[PDB]
Write a protein that holds these residues in place. Structure first.
Motif, PDB file in Angstrom:
ATOM      1  N   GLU A 120       0.800  -1.232   0.000  1.00  0.00           N
ATOM      2  CA  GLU A 120       0.000   0.000   0.000  1.00  0.00           C
ATOM      3  C   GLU A 120       0.821   1.265   0.000  1.00  0.00           C
ATOM      4  O   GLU A 120       0.308   2.327  -0.352  1.00  0.00           O
ATOM      5  N   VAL A 121       2.068   1.190   0.443  1.00  0.00           N
ATOM      6  CA  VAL A 121       2.920   2.379   0.378  1.00  0.00           C
ATOM      7  C   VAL A 121       4.336   1.895   0.244  1.00  0.00           C
ATOM      8  O   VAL A 121       4.761   0.980   0.920  1.00  0.00           O
ATOM      9  N   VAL A 122       5.054   2.477  -0.692  1.00  0.00           N
ATOM     10  CA  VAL A 122       6.412   2.053  -0.901  1.00  0.00           C
ATOM     11  C   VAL A 122       7.268   2.972  -0.096  1.00  0.00           C
ATOM     12  O   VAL A 122       7.653   4.011  -0.590  1.00  0.00           O
ATOM     13  N   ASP A 123       7.524   2.600   1.150  1.00  0.00           N
ATOM     14  CA  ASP A 123       8.321   3.423   2.051  1.00  0.00           C
ATOM     15  C   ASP A 123       9.754   2.928   2.167  1.00  0.00           C
ATOM     16  O   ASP A 123      10.253   2.200   1.302  1.00  0.00           O
ATOM     17  N   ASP A 124      10.451   3.320   3.223  1.00  0.00           N
ATOM     18  CA  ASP A 124      11.827   2.882   3.264  1.00  0.00           C
ATOM     19  C   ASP A 124      11.969   1.429   3.692  1.00  0.00           C
ATOM     20  O   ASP A 124      12.907   0.764   3.274  1.00  0.00           O
ATOM     21  N   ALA A 125      11.026   0.927   4.468  1.00  0.00           N
ATOM     22  CA  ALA A 125      11.082  -0.461   4.891  1.00  0.00           C
ATOM     23  C   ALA A 125      10.934  -1.341   3.645  1.00  0.00           C
ATOM     24  O   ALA A 125      11.655  -2.347   3.502  1.00  0.00           O
ATOM     25  N   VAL A 126      10.011  -0.967   2.755  1.00  0.00           N
ATOM     26  CA  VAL A 126       9.835  -1.731   1.522  1.00  0.00           C
ATOM     27  C   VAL A 126      11.163  -1.654   0.746  1.00  0.00           C
ATOM     28  O   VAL A 126      11.686  -2.697   0.275  1.00  0.00           O
ATOM     29  N   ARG A 127      11.759  -0.460   0.618  1.00  0.00           N
ATOM     30  CA  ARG A 127      13.031  -0.445  -0.137  1.00  0.00           C
ATOM     31  C   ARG A 127      14.145  -1.255   0.554  1.00  0.00           C
ATOM     32  O   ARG A 127      15.014  -1.801  -0.112  1.00  0.00           O
TER      33      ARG A 127
ATOM     34  N   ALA B 274       3.130  -2.165 -13.153  1.00  0.00           N
ATOM     35  CA  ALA B 274       3.617  -2.293 -11.783  1.00  0.00           C
ATOM     36  C   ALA B 274       3.991  -0.912 -11.252  1.00  0.00           C
ATOM     37  O   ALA B 274       3.879   0.094 -11.981  1.00  0.00           O
ATOM     38  N   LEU B 275       4.410  -0.879  -9.977  1.00  0.00           N
ATOM     39  CA  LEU B 275       4.915   0.349  -9.363  1.00  0.00           C
ATOM     40  C   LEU B 275       6.449   0.178  -9.322  1.00  0.00           C
ATOM     41  O   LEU B 275       6.949  -0.924  -9.116  1.00  0.00           O
ATOM     42  N   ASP B 276       7.183   1.270  -9.502  1.00  0.00           N
ATOM     43  CA  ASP B 276       8.631   1.177  -9.462  1.00  0.00           C
ATOM     44  C   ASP B 276       9.077   1.367  -8.002  1.00  0.00           C
ATOM     45  O   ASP B 276       8.237   1.407  -7.109  1.00  0.00           O
ATOM     46  N   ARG B 277      10.390   1.459  -7.787  1.00  0.00           N
ATOM     47  CA  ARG B 277      10.987   1.569  -6.440  1.00  0.00           C
ATOM     48  C   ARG B 277      10.594   2.829  -5.670  1.00  0.00           C
ATOM     49  O   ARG B 277      10.808   2.930  -4.438  1.00  0.00           O
TER      50      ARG B 277
ATOM     51  N   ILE C 167       6.653  -3.665  -8.115  1.00  0.00           N
ATOM     52  CA  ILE C 167       5.807  -3.771  -6.906  1.00  0.00           C
ATOM     53  C   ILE C 167       4.366  -3.882  -7.405  1.00  0.00           C
ATOM     54  O   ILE C 167       3.995  -3.220  -8.384  1.00  0.00           O
ATOM     55  N   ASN C 168       3.580  -4.747  -6.779  1.00  0.00           N
ATOM     56  CA  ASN C 168       2.198  -5.007  -7.208  1.00  0.00           C
ATOM     57  C   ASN C 168       2.171  -5.237  -8.750  1.00  0.00           C
ATOM     58  O   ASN C 168       1.407  -4.600  -9.481  1.00  0.00           O
ATOM     59  N   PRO C 169       3.011  -6.164  -9.254  1.00  0.00           N
ATOM     60  CA  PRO C 169       3.049  -6.423 -10.698  1.00  0.00           C
ATOM     61  C   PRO C 169       1.843  -7.181 -11.187  1.00  0.00           C
ATOM     62  O   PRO C 169       1.272  -8.002 -10.466  1.00  0.00           O
TER      63      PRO C 169
END
Ligand code: GNR
Ligand code: NI
Length: 166
Positions: free
Chosen positions: A21-28, A111-114, A73-75
């Protein structure tokens, strides 16, 4: 960090991953660990489900020199033709086995990128094969699911035996 890669028939590989739901720093940071795990295996792609993180995240690097990391992300993908192609596939979660799998030859990835921004991408060849294979992981599906039941059972039995010996 090098994360442990689950191996067939571990039931955790059948879990359906949840969208990010949110590409934050933990996801990165997870993405960075996934790439490290992937490059060290070594493999050309990896889905979060494979490292027991049930989120819709895929990383890949189809180069021979670590110069082309790709994040999805979410591909999702949609076949662009009805044509199919065969490719001998392997998987870090089914180590040591390579079998032919037929899949749509060309697909359009979304998809969503980084950074969390949406993009699309036409894929053919190794890229189209790998994106479909990784999205399958996120839906709890393995390439051995496309094989004959007897071949998949032979694979399972060998891996189960290896796991007991390890
Ligand atoms: O296990 C992996 C890495 C695999 S993906 C793949 C698919 C078709 C042919 C080769 C590969 N190689 C990988 O390393 N991804 O889930
Ligand atoms: Ni795989």
């Amino acid at each position: 960090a090098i994360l442990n890669i689950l191996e067939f028939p571990d039931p955790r590989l059948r879990t359906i991953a949840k969208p990010v739901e949110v590409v934050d720093d933990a996801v990165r940071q997870l993405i960075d660990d996934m790439f490290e795990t992937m490059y060290e295996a070594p493999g050309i792609g990896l889905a979060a489900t494979q490292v027991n993180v049930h989120k819709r995240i895929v990383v890949m690097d189809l180069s021979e020199d670590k110069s082309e990391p790709r994040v999805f992300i979410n591909p999702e993908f949609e076949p662009l033709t009805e044509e199919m192609d065969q490719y001998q596939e392997g998987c870090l979660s089914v180590p040591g086995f390579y079998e032919n799998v037929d899949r749509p030859q060309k697909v359009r990835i979304k998809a969503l990128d980084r950074d969390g921004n949406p993009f699309e991408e036409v894929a053919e060849g190794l890229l189209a094969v790998c994106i479909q294979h990784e999205c399958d992981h996120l839906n709890g599906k393995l390439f051995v699911d496309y094989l004959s039941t007897l071949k998949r059972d032979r694979i399972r039995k060998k891996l189960e035996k290896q796991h007991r010996q390890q």
